[model samples]
Target chain A: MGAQVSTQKTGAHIIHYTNINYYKDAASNSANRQDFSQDPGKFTEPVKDIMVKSLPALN
Target chain B: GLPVMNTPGSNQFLTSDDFQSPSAMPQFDVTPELNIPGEVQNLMEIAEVDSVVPVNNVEGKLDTMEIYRIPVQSGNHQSSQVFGFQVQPGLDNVFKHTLLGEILNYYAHWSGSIKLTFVFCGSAMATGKFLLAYAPPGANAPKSRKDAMLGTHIIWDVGLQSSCVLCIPWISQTHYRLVQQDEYTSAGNVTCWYQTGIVVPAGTPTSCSIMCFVSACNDFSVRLLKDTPFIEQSALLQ
Candidate 1:
């Protein structure tokens, strides 16, 4: 699951043994890859407000 | 007519050894909404990565992305779908509500080189979500009118697979109209390792966007739940 691969696994079966490679590809290509993903603290007040205003429509 | 022997290494005309399927059984490409199970199949003689298309990280200065390229078309329209819920109540735990996913159009223009990554999955919660989050440096902001739409178009052809033995993530058959646009609209598909700078001509402002509807159902046989969309298929394939 997150960047971890099987230690004993090898060969073509190695492809299916884990999803580490796909996650790597997806993350490597992603833009918001690091933007506030792990740390909600990274979200500035303006950014938090931007997300809040976008949350459905309460009104 | 004279009987001719089959040639494995022929210098003249074609032979069964030559024109036969160098590619795998290619019918999987015909599916309307299927994951990109790459060109060559695995030992099972099927797609790689999850329905993965083995992208050529071939010879090039700029990086390449394996993607299905649909032909550019004219005619402006919008499409949307409801995700994260089932239609029938008794089939599963009812969220009692559904989430709407509206296909938004992304217009891009740039110079030199840039990678437009349509990052499909995120976080440990790991729900597969599509995010359009990059633009070239010094990207010119959209002007009043002319900058609205042209050339490239990206459409979402979302599909779900719920076979009990096999787990699959939601597949986004994203259609990219990478070239020019005009009066005609026709459907076409090509798999390639599309390089960033090479595809965009020197001065032609490249563009794209398309709208797609993801269909869901409520049934006892349906192993897929609303939460199933995020389950990583590679692990399931294991």
Candidate 2:
């Protein structure tokens, strides 16, 4: 038996006690920590013209 | 250059023969597509915990989620600025809490039919799906999770250059509801209530690549359920 993690808030910012050392696990891995404050701008408006050639037929 | 009513069938400009239902059509209602577990739904829940709930909360977040405040007209053709956003690929799924009646005072009342079209832009050669919910606005929003008004299998197959124009003319005999996602309860349901993820995979890519963006619009024929005396008294149909 152990202390329950019932009412705690955990996300990209907090590490889960169970999978704390995911980096060492190798094959099976957890997601990468996302920092919304610092975005790569890839997801931002005006996608690369080279990538999305020609507007969709529906537009 | 100028733009016209661009949505397919959104604006016919000219009248064809008298409007008649097609002789034969597929059923309007469809069941939800189970790609991802129904129990795991939405960005909030997924990003918040990054793992199973009561199970363990983990660090690490998905890539690219951007929200924009744009003027979104409702099914009822009213004025309101709604929410729109984009997330990076694994098929990025953005959760919209944008109430169809966000700016106005109203509740959902089932009506005749609904004409909604989703615009999918960006991305190359990819498969996708669209799931939405019809519930309440503001305080009553979560109430949808407790009920059965969710429309999970709303659309699919974007990019891939296959065909991604998602148009819906839900002809039926029910009430009107806003489009949104999955949620739930109990032994309680012991599963996820609702989620757009099953169709769109939320991968564990610590890094993300720019992918898809989606926004929606309703036909002029659609309208919302309103009771505000201010709106009712005005001669102008807002």
Candidate 3:
């Protein structure tokens, strides 16, 4: 089964549900947001490679 | 209490983002015996079109864009498993062989980035036949002697899903050190993405971007067989 999301679909999701208001704090030319205080958990840990471990963060 | 390192936002103490590459570039090199296969090469060509990178674009100007960063590790961590297979008769010899083996390949990727994009299911095919067609870029290059190998590493951890049921691509690798050297001889972990660039040939009109160079291993699972297989995953979450 397709447990994965296509890149195109992910892009579409980004564009569709993106917060336009959040653009003001966006770091220029950088993917990182300089002011992430507004977006809680914006930098969440990513899913691990499916090849093995599936440990959840305790924090 | 244990020895405390620093504060959470200590790195943020820096004030300027404007900086150039060092006068003498960091020499992070290794000689792994894997080649960029034709299939994987083709897939990369198709997938990397317009992928985002921090480098100046075709216009010689950096595009103001937002990108996502995913970190997979917080400490020196690991995960592994074992697999089994069988062989049958072939040619004049009875090639019939039962396979009880595990592929223990790992990537120690730190900080890197990738321009993400979606193309004609190229990633799926790329992931499927990875072992058969996959080869490291510096397969023929000689290894340069160095102390601790330091540089950006890249691992193309490809994934798929229709709605959201995650299917794991089971793979494995073990870490060890050489006799004389106490340091680990395995280039099994460090991930350097800047060295990993995507090229496109003239003539495709499709658009794509390097979404992000996520911090994780790009693992592929393979089964034993006389021939290789390349079947795209059936979408269930869609």
Worst 10 residues of 1 chain B by lDDT: B102-111
Second chain TM-score, each model: 0.14, 0.23, 0.18
Candidate 2 per-residue lDDT, tens place, B122-166, comes to 333233333333332222332333342342223344454443322
Model 2, A4-53: lDDT tens digits are 33223364533333323312222333333333232222222235444453
DockQ of 3: 0.02
**Per-candidate total of colliding backbone pairs:** 13, 18, 46
Q: Ten-residue segment with the worst summed lDDT in candidate 3 chain B?
A: B96-105
Query: Which portions of model 3 miss their true places by more than 4 Å?
Result: A1-59, B1-59, B62-138, B141-206, B217-238
| Model 1 misplaced regions, further than 4 Å | A1-38, A41-59, B1-71, B75-238
Between candidates 1 and 2, the one scoring higher on TM-score is: 2
lDDT, candidate 1, at B214: 21
Candidate 3: what lDDT? Answer: 0.23
Shift of residue B163 alpha carbon in model 1, Å:
29
Docking class for model 1 is: incorrect
Superposed model 2: Cα runs more than 4 Å off: A1-59, B1-99, B103-165, B168-172, B175-238
Docking class of 3: incorrect
lDDT of 1 by residue, B1-238 (tens): 9998986755666432312222334333343676653333211111011122112223451244322222221123112111111111111222111111100011111011111212122112211212111111122422322231221223222123111111112222322221122213112111111111112224433343222112111110111112323235655545
| TM-scores for all predictions | 0.14, 0.22, 0.17
Candidate 1 vs candidate 2, DockQ winner? 1
